[PDB]
Amino acid sequence: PGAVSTSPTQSPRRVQPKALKPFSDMNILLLENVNATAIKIFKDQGYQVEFHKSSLPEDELIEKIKDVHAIGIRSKTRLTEKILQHARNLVCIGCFCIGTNQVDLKYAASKGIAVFNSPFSNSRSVAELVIGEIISLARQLGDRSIELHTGTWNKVAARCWEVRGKTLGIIGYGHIGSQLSVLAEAMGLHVLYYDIVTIMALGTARQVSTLDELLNKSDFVTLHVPATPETEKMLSAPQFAAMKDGAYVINASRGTVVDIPSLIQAVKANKIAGAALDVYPHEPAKNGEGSFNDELNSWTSELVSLPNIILTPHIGGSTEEAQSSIGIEVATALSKYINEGNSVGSVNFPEVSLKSLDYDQENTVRVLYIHRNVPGVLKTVNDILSDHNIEKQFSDSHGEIAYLMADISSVNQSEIKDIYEKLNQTSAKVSIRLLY
Amino acid sequence: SPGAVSTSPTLPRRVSKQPKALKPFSTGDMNILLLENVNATAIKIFKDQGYQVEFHKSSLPEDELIEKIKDVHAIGIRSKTRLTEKILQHARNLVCIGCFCIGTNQVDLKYAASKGIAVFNSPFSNSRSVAELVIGEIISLARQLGDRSIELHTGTWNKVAARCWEVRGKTLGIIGYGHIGSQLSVLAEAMGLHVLYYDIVTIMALGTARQVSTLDELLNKSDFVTLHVPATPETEKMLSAPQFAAMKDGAYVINASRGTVVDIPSLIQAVKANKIAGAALDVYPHEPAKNGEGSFNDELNSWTSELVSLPNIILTPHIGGSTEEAQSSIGIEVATALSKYINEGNSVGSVNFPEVSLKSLDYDQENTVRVLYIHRNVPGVLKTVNDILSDHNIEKQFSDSHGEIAYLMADISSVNQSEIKDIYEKLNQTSAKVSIRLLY
Amino acid sequence: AVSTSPTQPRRVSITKQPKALKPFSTGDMNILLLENVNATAIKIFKDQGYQVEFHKSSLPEDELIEKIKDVHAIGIRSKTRLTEKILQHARNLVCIGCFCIGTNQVDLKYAASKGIAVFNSPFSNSRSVAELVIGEIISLARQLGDRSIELHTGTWNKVAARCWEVRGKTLGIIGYGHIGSQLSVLAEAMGLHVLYYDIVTIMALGTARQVSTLDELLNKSDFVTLHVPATPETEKMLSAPQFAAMKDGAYVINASRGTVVDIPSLIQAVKANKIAGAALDVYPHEPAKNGEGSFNDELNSWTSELVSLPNIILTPHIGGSTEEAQSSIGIEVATALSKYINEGNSVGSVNFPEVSLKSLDYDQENTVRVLYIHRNVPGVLKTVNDILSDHNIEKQFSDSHGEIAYLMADISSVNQSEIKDIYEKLNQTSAKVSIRLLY
Amino acid sequence: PGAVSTSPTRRVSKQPKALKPFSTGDMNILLLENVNATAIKIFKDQGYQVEFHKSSLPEDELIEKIKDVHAIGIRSKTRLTEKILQHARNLVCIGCFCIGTNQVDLKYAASKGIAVFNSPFSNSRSVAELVIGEIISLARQLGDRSIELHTGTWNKVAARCWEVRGKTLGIIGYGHIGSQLSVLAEAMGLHVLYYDIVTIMALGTARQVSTLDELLNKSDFVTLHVPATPETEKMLSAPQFAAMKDGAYVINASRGTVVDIPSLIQAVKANKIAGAALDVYPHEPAKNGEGSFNDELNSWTSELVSLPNIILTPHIGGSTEEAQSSIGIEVATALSKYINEGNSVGSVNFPEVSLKSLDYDQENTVRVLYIHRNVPGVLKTVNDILSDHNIEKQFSDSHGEIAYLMADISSVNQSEIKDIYEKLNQTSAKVSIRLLY
Numbered sequence A: 001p002g003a004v005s006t007s008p009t010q011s012p013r014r015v016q017p018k019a020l021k022p023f024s025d026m027n028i029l030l031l032e033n034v035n036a037t038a039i040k041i042f043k044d045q046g047y048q049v050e051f052h053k054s055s056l057p058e059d060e061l062i063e064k065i066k067d068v069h070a071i072g073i074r075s076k077t078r079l080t081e082k083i084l085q086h087a088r089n090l091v092c093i094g095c096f097c098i099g100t101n102q103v104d105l106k107y108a109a110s111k112g113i114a115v116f117n118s119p120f121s122n123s124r125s126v127a128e129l130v131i132g133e134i135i136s137l138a139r140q141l142g143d144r145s146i147e148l149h150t151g152t153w154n155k156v157a158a159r160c161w162e163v164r165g166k167t168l169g170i171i172g173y174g175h176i177g178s179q180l181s182v183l184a185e186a187m188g189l190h191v192l193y194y195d196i197v198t199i200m201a202l203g204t205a206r207q208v209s210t211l212d213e214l215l216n217k218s219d220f221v222t223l224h225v226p227a228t229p230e231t232e233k234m235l236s237a238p239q240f241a242a243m244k245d246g247a248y249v250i251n252a253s254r255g256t257v258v259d260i261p262s263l264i265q266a267v268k269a270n271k272i273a274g275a276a277l278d279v280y281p282h283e284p285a286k287n288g289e290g291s292f293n294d295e296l297n298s299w300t301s302e303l304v305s306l307p308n309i310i311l312t313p314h315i316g317g318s319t320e321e322a323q324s325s326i327g328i329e330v331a332t333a334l335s336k337y338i339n340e341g342n343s344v345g346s347v348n349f350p351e352v353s354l355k356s357l358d359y360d361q362e363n364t365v366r367v368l369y370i371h372r373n374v375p376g377v378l379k380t381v382n383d384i385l386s387d388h389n390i391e392k393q394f395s396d397s398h399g400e401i402a403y404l405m406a407d408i409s410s411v412n413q414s415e416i417k418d419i420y421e422k423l424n425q426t427s428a429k430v431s432i433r434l435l436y
Numbered sequence B: 001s002p003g004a005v006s007t008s009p010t011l012p013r014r015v016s017k018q019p020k021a022l023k024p025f026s027t028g029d030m031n032i033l034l035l036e037n038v039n040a041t042a043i044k045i046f047k048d049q050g051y052q053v054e055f056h057k058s059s060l061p062e063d064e065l066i067e068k069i070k071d072v073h074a075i076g077i078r079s080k081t082r083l084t085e086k087i088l089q090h091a092r093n094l095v096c097i098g099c100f101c102i103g104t105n106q107v108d109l110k111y112a113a114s115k116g117i118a119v120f121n122s123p124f125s126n127s128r129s130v131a132e133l134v135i136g137e138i139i140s141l142a143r144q145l146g147d148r149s150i151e152l153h154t155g156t157w158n159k160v161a162a163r164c165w166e167v168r169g170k171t172l173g174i175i176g177y178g179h180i181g182s183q184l185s186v187l188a189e190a191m192g193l194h195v196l197y198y199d200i201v202t203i204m205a206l207g208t209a210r211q212v213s214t215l216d217e218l219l220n221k222s223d224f225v226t227l228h229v230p231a232t233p234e235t236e237k238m239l240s241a242p243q244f245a246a247m248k249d250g251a252y253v254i255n256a257s258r259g260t261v262v263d264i265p266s267l268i269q270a271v272k273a274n275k276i277a278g279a280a281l282d283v284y285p286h287e288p289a290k291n292g293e294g295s296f297n298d299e300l301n302s303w304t305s306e307l308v309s310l311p312n313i314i315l316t317p318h319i320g321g322s323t324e325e326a327q328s329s330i331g332i333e334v335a336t337a338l339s340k341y342i343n344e345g346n347s348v349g350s351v352n353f354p355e356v357s358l359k360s361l362d363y364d365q366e367n368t369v370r371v372l373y374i375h376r377n378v379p380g381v382l383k384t385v386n387d388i389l390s391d392h393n394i395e396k397q398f399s400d401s402h403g404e405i406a407y408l409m410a411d412i413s414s415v416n417q418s419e420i421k422d423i424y425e426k427l428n429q430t431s432a433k434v435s436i437r438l439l440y
Numbered sequence C: 001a002v003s004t005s006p007t008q009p010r011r012v013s014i015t016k017q018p019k020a021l022k023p024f025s026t027g028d029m030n031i032l033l034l035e036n037v038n039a040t041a042i043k044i045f046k047d048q049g050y051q052v053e054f055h056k057s058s059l060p061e062d063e064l065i066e067k068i069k070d071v072h073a074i075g076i077r078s079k080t081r082l083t084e085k086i087l088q089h090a091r092n093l094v095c096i097g098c099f100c101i102g103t104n105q106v107d108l109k110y111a112a113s114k115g116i117a118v119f120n121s122p123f124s125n126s127r128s129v130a131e132l133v134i135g136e137i138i139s140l141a142r143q144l145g146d147r148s149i150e151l152h153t154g155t156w157n158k159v160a161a162r163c164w165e166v167r168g169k170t171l172g173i174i175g176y177g178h179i180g181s182q183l184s185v186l187a188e189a190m191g192l193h194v195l196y197y198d199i200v201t202i203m204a205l206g207t208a209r210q211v212s213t214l215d216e217l218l219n220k221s222d223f224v225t226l227h228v229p230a231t232p233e234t235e236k237m238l239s240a241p242q243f244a245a246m247k248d249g250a251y252v253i254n255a256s257r258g259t260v261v262d263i264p265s266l267i268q269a270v271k272a273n274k275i276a277g278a279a280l281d282v283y284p285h286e287p288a289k290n291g292e293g294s295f296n297d298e299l300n301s302w303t304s305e306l307v308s309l310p311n312i313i314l315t316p317h318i319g320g321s322t323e324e325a326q327s328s329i330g331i332e333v334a335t336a337l338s339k340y341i342n343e344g345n346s347v348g349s350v351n352f353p354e355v356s357l358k359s360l361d362y363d364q365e366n367t368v369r370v371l372y373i374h375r376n377v378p379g380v381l382k383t384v385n386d387i388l389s390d391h392n393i394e395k396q397f398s399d400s401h402g403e404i405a406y407l408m409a410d411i412s413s414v415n416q417s418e419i420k421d422i423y424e425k426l427n428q429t430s431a432k433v434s435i436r437l438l439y
Numbered sequence D: 001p002g003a004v005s006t007s008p009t010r011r012v013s014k015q016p017k018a019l020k021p022f023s024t025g026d027m028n029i030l031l032l033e034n035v036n037a038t039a040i041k042i043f044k045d046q047g048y049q050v051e052f053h054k055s056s057l058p059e060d061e062l063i064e065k066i067k068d069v070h071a072i073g074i075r076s077k078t079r080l081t082e083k084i085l086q087h088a089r090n091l092v093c094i095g096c097f098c099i100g101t102n103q104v105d106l107k108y109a110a111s112k113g114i115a116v117f118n119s120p121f122s123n124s125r126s127v128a129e130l131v132i133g134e135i136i137s138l139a140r141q142l143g144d145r146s147i148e149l150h151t152g153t154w155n156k157v158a159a160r161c162w163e164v165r166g167k168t169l170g171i172i173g174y175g176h177i178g179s180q181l182s183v184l185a186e187a188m189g190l191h192v193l194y195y196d197i198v199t200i201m202a203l204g205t206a207r208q209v210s211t212l213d214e215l216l217n218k219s220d221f222v223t224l225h226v227p228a229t230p231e232t233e234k235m236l237s238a239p240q241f242a243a244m245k246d247g248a249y250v251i252n253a254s255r256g257t258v259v260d261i262p263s264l265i266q267a268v269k270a271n272k273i274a275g276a277a278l279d280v281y282p283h284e285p286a287k288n289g290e291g292s293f294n295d296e297l298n299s300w301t302s303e304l305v306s307l308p309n310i311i312l313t314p315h316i317g318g319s320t321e322e323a324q325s326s327i328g329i330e331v332a333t334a335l336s337k338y339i340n341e342g343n344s345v346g347s348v349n350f351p352e353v354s355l356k357s358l359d360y361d362q363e364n365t366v367r368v369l370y371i372h373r374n375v376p377g378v379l380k381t382v383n384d385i386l387s388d389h390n391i392e393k394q395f396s397d398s399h400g401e402i403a404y405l406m407a408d409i410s411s412v413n414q415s416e417i418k419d420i421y422e423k424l425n426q427t428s429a430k431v432s433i434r435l436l437y
């Protein structure tokens, strides 16, 4: 009838390293008003920081970047071949943001320049926004507050709903989708999610096989997808046709993923009761007045005349929490690459690291040798280092570039200069630093 | 020794005799009048009882109401329809009044009670709708959503993260830890907020909230301050200049309680001085009585012009309980309450009447009759009634007094169709009688 | 369409302080407590003004009859039998406290016919039984008892074979009542899947699942525990066919009733290597006192065979035998008597009509409470309400339990003079069983 | 004035390449001391040939058996000395299916390029559950109750019998076991305090206490989850028992040495300690046996076993089917990844070295596993020998006098393999070389 047998095998934080210095104080340039957390991390390392609140014109940048060891940018400052080619001293680039398209990664890598970003530091800020907007759409808060500001009193309960017992449809169950799932359940929503992949539910959310089943059974539909050919305009006339009468659409994902004119048709036809958009096919480049208009997007005027539409200026990760933790994530990443040669989490460089050295390891030196990925190079380097015990050593390749880290013992101030000069003279060399 | 090991200090729902369906000795079918667009849930409950329902979406003029209420057994109103002696005095048949709302002031309770007319309301069925609103507004204030959406609608793009905060790790100060305060406490903890609460009573925390001894400790340590208090002399203008002075630089004020409890001009000063970073108000010292355009202006409240000038103020027209869920559960709560008073004489939860009920009778208790005798609260009346019913075993009996009115319910066995008519006529002829119904 | 959802803190009570009522013709109240009732009961009774006589033992029928002549309330446990023979001499007895679950040691029907209200504590033992079952699940899983018996005789036997970690295992709970449900939550916390069978549909706590047949439970369970009442349908409800339906190497725990398991079948199943272990707290026949040669083949024919077996925990009805349980029995039952003696509250009584009224405000000077227990016949309310008719009855509640009935009335504007009159008149009525006045 | 301030701050996923050794005929595994069937299944599913025994082996038959063996699994009883490891031509790695490694000459094994693995933490849940069972059992005197009725005594007693809910558990050592116990104990409704020589972040709502003396003062049950160090030696003795509550309880499933049994016995005799559960004693029998636990082994045995409400267990804290089976998986997996990929992470005698697996489609990539003497010049030689191929990547680490290089090299055809093996095999510093292709 059965037997008692072995259960299936299941499936805290607690409280001395050597401070390494380069043979060459380092100079950091921070643009586009990076958070003060980044600034404090860099100053506490001894580094000299130059801080600006704006991007710089191509002219002043080329002048500034000549003598700089690390630069922090956001989405606005373009680092092209044109401007990176004058960067004699540049060790690494910090992108205090998710995007890296504003940097010529291929070129940066070929000069031995490591690039870091913060891809996931914004998840919580977007999830909270969507909760706020579910409630705000449910209750038509925006409309109520606009009315009373113009002096109109319109106390309405009709089609104004409580969120408890309603269905949230999450399209894309990723970093943000999943954090949202848990908040939504805590606010008493049933969570369905469609994804092109099978994913393990958090809490008591249920994965649905087709988009059509989600749109059919959902009161609120929210999008948390990347920009791909398949996500392009993936919500359009036929999707809105498949949704419940008086259902709600929220998009804080990508400007392209929803067909705004179809949305506008659906809202006009009383099929969709509300929408919140944080992202649009075309967005201003700077902040300012009459930026959001029919020159930018043809339907801007038509949308601004609809009831119960929340429109936001791409502010999903626009919190002090998000900016400060981007500051820490990226300043830490640079700080460990400059101080230890740690390239883990870089988007353009081979990923390489070694355990820190004890305070007690006098006269150990760390070789950071970026080089062309061809046969013969380790032969040369390990020949040059032959007079010293290599405690340990790690090399990895990323296409046509490669990165060796080596720890060598019994090196006096004299022998360092010798080893630098020899490694500097090698055929395959792209960049060499010694940490001492 | 450092003490001794000694004694520590100290069910789920189960599906578990059918009740007897009790008919009035009134041959006439019951007539329900529902005004002011009571929810369809109420209508359904009444029709399924057999009752005849007349439904209006508006109040009625005093003329048509007096005509209509002559032959009505139960009336449902909301806050608009005033039931005064003037109009209740013509109500021959009226058993009970339903207030499908929190307020009972629209009704002359004292007068209604003296005619044996029981009044019921729904005090608490709006709690969840208010708690959800406050969560929405904490986030909306934290992120300046309203301002962002107003900007982009006029064509201004202003992407700002300065003065924008993730609610996680912030402190919610709840003033009044009642029905709404407590439901808010749980939602706030789930959204990752620390909860403090001040209350003039000691109350057991839900989740991991902590009660604080003084208002001033709450104001000092809170990022968002929300009010969930009644309108009393002590709550009148209890948030003013000195309270805002005690609050954190860049803290937020939410008032969805009573329009008297906050001094709007002091808050306007505090917002102007960059001491308060945002506010959401659902309630005001003076509110329009109808919905309309240019209702919310300086004739009604002097500061309107300045208030609506400010950044990051959410203004709402008393919409805290304005949901379909809230209205529908008001429908069930109040229609059920009337239905049990009409069918069983249950007066528990009534606001103008003694609170009296008895266990239902089993389906198989043939020839048991229930006496519902509303009467003047004076000596001798139980003596009379229990004399009139001495030829019968009283299975059980409950009488309570509320001022000058009192309410006897009695279950009596071994009564045939003959003896019912006798008992009605006798009780109907008594000196203290205000109202008698028999259920069989 | 988007449509309407389906419909879905204790505080210091600032009330007007209640009025403390005293008895009228009574000088003082005498409580007799037998069978070593907890000190919590003693404290509650002394704080009420009552005079307490405390014994650690039952009393011989001789000394008891002498003692209960002049007694207002008696507290017993399971041993002291209160028969017609001994209750017939009880002139003054207002109420009986059973500081335990059982009320069979009392002649309830007789007690009721003399107007004597009986109270018990049915559910104050739940947590003590649930914890015991957790301890025993682990102890059986790991064969602790056997290991410790071995080493005490000097034998070292490190064994891992068919010793298990409870996490991942299935607890089958038969009877999802007060104990069943508390056990459910502890079991899930110790990482067990919980199934439960019950003859009623019941809402699961946590992530337990109710199963439609007993046989599904027995099939899918590693540990089967019973928390069921003693009924004709629970009698030997685990027998050969149930053990046959259980997993090879599954475990049986009975801390419910002595009759619910067939021990000869259990013994067979353990002998046939079908059942790997059992814990019994209850047996069809139990000693009456504690003693050294009590648990033997005279008491139960299979004892020598049962005690022969490996990995069987035998315990002497200690399911509820904790300091916590005894002390909270003390509070529950002493409170219940205290409120019946002081306020006439009969709610939770096992032999009387359930009747109470809201307390009176402190400032209701000259309001008196009539407690009139009487024969459930026509005309008695007529008489009483006649006797009271010179006074406003603020409120009044009468309920009937077969042939006995209980009226409580609050009456205003009564001076010390009119009290004596009203007592004497109610005392003289034909239907009267007992009358007290509180003022 | 104050100021609002910044807060503090499941998916299925390129198949791997299955790498074969260059000069192997079949892999031979020897498993001793009745290793769990989970290990056996993992090895058979790799293709390996498995020989399984339920007992340790005599030194004679072992030396014969280990000549031709690629991997051996032992537990604590088998002793792998220089004497017996010196005959092991083909031995790649040793599996300790247990927490102990002292039964192995680690230093010697390392110097021959023999990697040793264990399962240090596989037992944590089994020990935590035992302590829960024993807290309840001591609280209620279950053992005594069951011993009484078995002798025919009926003794229904509630005195000094307690419910655990509302009682205080003092955990000494908030490690792998301490921390799992913390969560179970809270769920059973105990307050948890813990002392540790390190500051550690509480799970749930447990509170770390500064001194041992505060723990002993405020605790109803004291349980020990520490390693064997000079500081833990007899750390519970007369003065600690003096500091504990009248009628408190002591549980030791840590190490045989950490409690002074004489003082415990005095404290129990004086009615200061109401009960104790011991799983570990300073001296323990060597086999299971019927007269083993006595005054020859520990002078206090006859006195200890006299006492009421003392649970005595035979080191059964990690004696469950679950624990043995997950030791099976942990250690068989560890060997399997070392044999198949050269992964040495979690090894106790060898350097810790690993690389990402290779994609299925990387034909003619070869992995060099070169164990060697930790001296200058060796990487120079090896990287010279390999210089006619692109090194995709390469990792070398040293552990004292031994060191371990892993390299991935591309564009290697069936011919060039034999050349590279022979050259690496001929180098002065070489201790062991395998090629995977």
Ligand SMILES: NC(=O)c1ccc[n+]([C@@H]2O[C@H](COP(=O)([O-])OP(=O)(O)OC[C@H]3O[C@@H](n4cnc5c(N)ncnc54)[C@H](O)[C@@H]3O)[C@@H](O)[C@H]2O)c1
Pocket: A098, A119, A120, A122, A123, A126, A171, A172, A173, A174, A175, A176, A177, A194, A195, A196, A197, A224, A225, A226, A227, A228, A230, A231, A234, A252, A253, A254, A278, A279, A314, A315, A316, A317, A318
């Ligand atoms: N509004 C903002 O300011 C802001 C800020 C941060 C992130 N985002 C954006 O939001 C999106 C989601 O963010 P994330 O970090 O959680 O992403 P993610 O990488 O964690 O997950 C994306 C999910 O989408 C799923 N997916 C991909 N294509 C799909 C399709 N066609 N249909 C359904 N599911 C599909 C993937 O399986 C994955 O689960 C991204 O585009 C991200 O850049 C916006």
Ligand SMILES: NC(=O)c1ccc[n+]([C@@H]2O[C@H](COP(=O)([O-])OP(=O)(O)OC[C@H]3O[C@@H](n4cnc5c(N)ncnc54)[C@H](O)[C@@H]3O)[C@@H](O)[C@H]2O)c1
Pocket: B102, B123, B124, B126, B127, B130, B175, B176, B177, B178, B179, B180, B181, B198, B199, B200, B201, B228, B229, B230, B231, B232, B234, B235, B256, B257, B258, B282, B283, B318, B319, B320, B321, B322
């Ligand atoms: N916005 C709306 O549409 C709407 C809807 C429903 C309720 N409300 C109002 O909001 C309030 C909350 O209603 P509720 O059901 O939660 O009330 P409640 O009676 O359940 O709780 C009120 C709490 O306030 C506390 N309290 C009273 N005076 C206090 C004071 N001076 N300071 C601190 N604590 C004090 C009480 O102890 C109690 O805990 C009421 O005034 C109610 O009328 C508004």
Ligand SMILES: NC(=O)c1ccc[n+]([C@@H]2O[C@H](COP(=O)([O-])OP(=O)(O)OC[C@H]3O[C@@H](n4cnc5c(N)ncnc54)[C@H](O)[C@@H]3O)[C@@H](O)[C@H]2O)c1
Pocket: C101, C122, C123, C125, C126, C129, C174, C175, C176, C177, C178, C179, C180, C197, C198, C199, C200, C227, C228, C229, C230, C231, C233, C234, C237, C255, C256, C257, C281, C282, C317, C318, C319, C320, C321
């Ligand atoms: N061992 C002890 O010292 C001790 C102490 C307390 C209680 N108990 C006994 O344990 C039992 C459980 O106690 P409780 O307070 O939880 O009782 P309870 O009344 O709360 O629960 C009993 C449950 O059994 C269910 N049930 C009844 N007949 C059934 C049947 N034949 N099959 C399955 N389910 C059935 C009922 O529906 C109910 O859910 C009782 O017999 C009680 O006297 C023993």
Ligand SMILES: NC(=O)c1ccc[n+]([C@@H]2O[C@H](COP(=O)([O-])OP(=O)(O)OC[C@H]3O[C@@H](n4cnc5c(N)ncnc54)[C@H](O)[C@@H]3O)[C@@H](O)[C@H]2O)c1
Pocket: D120, D121, D123, D124, D127, D172, D173, D174, D175, D176, D177, D178, D195, D196, D197, D198, D225, D226, D227, D228, D229, D231, D232, D253, D254, D255, D279, D280, D315, D316, D317, D318, D319
């Ligand atoms: N009974 C058994 O069969 C069995 C099974 C497994 C483990 N164990 C033993 O149990 C112990 C705990 O195992 P674990 O995995 O939790 O170990 P662990 O290393 O994870 O934790 C030990 C903890 O003790 C602390 N500690 C060390 N010295 C201390 C001192 N003097 N005072 C207080 N705290 C101190 C450490 O800080 C650490 O947190 C070990 O000794 C282990 O061998 C026994």
